[PDB]
Amino acid sequence: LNSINTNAGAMIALQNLNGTNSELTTVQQRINTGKKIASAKDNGAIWATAKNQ
Amino acid sequence: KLQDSLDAGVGNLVDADLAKESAKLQSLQTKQQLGVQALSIANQSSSSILSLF
Amino acid sequence: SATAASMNAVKDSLQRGQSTIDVALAAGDTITDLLGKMKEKALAASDTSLNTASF
Which of B11, B33, C20, C33 lies 20 to 30 angstroms, CA to CA, from B23? Predict the structure, then answer.
């Protein structure tokens, strides 16, 4: 396939780059906040137990 | 991911594989020149009759 | 020539099946991550030392 319209490989590479950027921003927030569970989105149940404690 | 898959499927459905037409173009151009020459050879057939008289 | 021209439909069905399996694999990635999170949830709930609110 030598299409000049669709470029599936660039879409796959963009998906992998987006996933890498997500892991990197997760590491950035975990480094700056100092917590692996800084909010309810990280783990609602453990966040609830930690807040009550 | 589903959006990228749908776009890749539409590209599979309609996009041309240009590497094949890259050769088809030159082949049809040579064939067009040969056809023009053949029709030009055909046009003069009546002239041979003129020498007979 | 007709037998050769007919192969485009075969290639089309093959790519359609590939795309269907691709969508299924994306959904399976989601389902496996969710099943793993369910595993640590049940593993934590199995502990008897938790209070009622945590369970």
Answer: B11
